[PDB]
Amino acid sequence: IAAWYLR
Amino acid sequence: VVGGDECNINEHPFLVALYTSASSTIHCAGALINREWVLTAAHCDRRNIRIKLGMHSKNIRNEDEQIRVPRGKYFCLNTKFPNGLDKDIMLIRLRRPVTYSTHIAPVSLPSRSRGVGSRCRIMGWGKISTTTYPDVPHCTNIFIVKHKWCEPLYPWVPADSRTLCAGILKGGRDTCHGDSGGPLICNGEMHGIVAGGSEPCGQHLKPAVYTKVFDYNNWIQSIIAGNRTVTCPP
Ligand SMILES: *[C@@H]1O[C@H](CO)[C@@H](O[C@@H]2O[C@H](CO)[C@@H](O[C@@H]3O[C@H](CO)[C@@H](O)[C@H](O)[C@@H]3O)[C@H](O)[C@H]2NC(C)=O)[C@H](O)[C@H]1NC(C)=O
Ligand SMILES: OC[C@H]1O[C@@H](O)[C@H](O)[C@@H](O)[C@@H]1O
Ligand SMILES: OC[C@H]1O[C@H](O)[C@H](O)[C@@H](O)[C@@H]1O
Ligand SMILES: [Zn+2]
Ligand SMILES: [Zn+2]
Ligand SMILES: [Zn+2]
């Protein structure tokens, strides 16, 4: 999971 | 939420804000699904989580605004990823139930599956621009779109993922940082839980990912019922 994905 | 406007103060009674005892920053949202249960995303969990119910403005309190802490937290037992974020969902049992009131009311789980083309509403206290977090929740409408739009953007979200791909293909409207855990409302029901999306938010052809609630309907109802061995859909 990319670091910029989770909101 | 980017590309939207302030939500109507009375249209989101099921919307809850998650923060912690250490900060007033709202890091996620959630949805009240009955008097003592909140549905949100697993990655919104914090060791000292605090939940505000019946709130609109972060600074101006509603007469019936309430604060609660968990008495229990529940996650999917069976997940593909060790951190369980392939099934980004969690149930929080409130230490004390709330009384339904003007600004506090439950939202219904999905009565049937909704797919491509359905118009839905997103809402949260997440970023409203690359530089600003709001004090009041913002709302806008988006559409569930073909999962294919999401697959290439998020390799970790397979075509077999129990998720909904949603947004505005044109760009401009999308959830954003701090909106995770909140509800994707379609036809008055909570069909999704905000999970994640692209960076920056609101780009052309970059819809976001929402956990598909309908699939977890039995798991959710069994946990609430008191079952503690039930498992999430495979
Ligand atoms: C919590 O929820 C789980 C899952 O719904 C409950 O376990 C499940 O219970 C059913 C009914 O007892 C099991 O099905 C039964 O299987 C037998 C054959 O093994 C069959 O003869 C019966 O007609 C029925 O189909 C099901 O396999 C079982 N699931 C598993 C893997 O455990 C559990 O009982 C609930 N806990 C509570 C509230 O007691
Ligand atoms: O932002 C959510 C909440 O954070 C708390 O730390 C503040 O004291 C509250 O006034 C606020 O509603
Ligand atoms: O206010 C909630 C409603 O917002 C918009 O009208 C959506 O299109 C609809 O699906 C949703 O139920
Ligand atoms: Zn605004
Ligand atoms: Zn009101
Ligand atoms: Zn961003």
The range of the structural domain enclosing residue B96 comes to: 13-106+215-227
Same domain for B130 and B172?
yes
Please list, in sequence order, all residues whose beta carbon lies within 8 angstroms of the beta carbon of residue B155, skipping any fewer than 6 positions away: none
Same domain for B115 and B210?
yes
User: Quick check: B214 and B144 in contact, CB under 8 A?
Assistant: no
Q: What is the Å distance from ligand 1's center to B111 Cα?
A: 24
CA-CA-CA-CA dihedral for B22, B139, B213, B109, to nearest 10: 100
Structure tokens at B175: 């959830």
CA-CA-CA-CA dihedral for B107, B43, B220, B144, to nearest 10: 60
What is the distance of C-alpha B176 from the center of its chain? 12
- B43 catalytic? Reply is yes
Pocket of ligand 1 contains residue B222 by CB under 6 Å: yes
Nearest CA-CA partner of B193 in B94, B75, B71: B75
Same domain for B7 and B123?
yes
| Phi, psi for residue B200 in degrees, rounded to 5 | -70, 165
CATH number assigned to the domain comprising residue B138: 2.40.10.10
Q: Which residues of B touch A5 (CB under 8 A)?
A: 154, 156, 196-199
DSSP string, chain B: -BS-EEPPTTS-TTEEEEEETTEEEEEEEEEEEETTEEEE-GGG--TTEEEEES-SSSSS--TT-EEE-EEEEEE-SS-SSTT-GGG--EEEEESS----BTTB---BPPSS---TT-EEEEEESS-SBTTB--SS-EEEEEEEE-GGGTTTT-TTS-TTSSEEEEE-TTSS-B--TT-TT-EEEETTEEEEEEEE--SSTT-TT--EEEEEGGGGHHHHHHHHHT-SS-----
What is the distance of C-alpha B206 from the center of its chain? 19
Q: What is the Å distance from ligand 4's center to B155 Cα?
A: 33
Amino acid occupying residue B142: I
- B118 catalytic? Reply is no
Amino acid occupying residue B98: V
What is the count of residue pairs from A and B with beta carbons less than 8 Å apart? 32
DSSP helix/strand/coil, A6: strand
**B46/A contact by beta carbon, under 8 A:** no
How many domains does chain B divide into?
2
| Phi, psi for residue B128 in degrees, rounded to 5 | -110, 0
- CA B79-B82-B88 angle, 5° bins: 55
d(CA B154, CA B160): 13
- B180 catalytic? Reply is yes
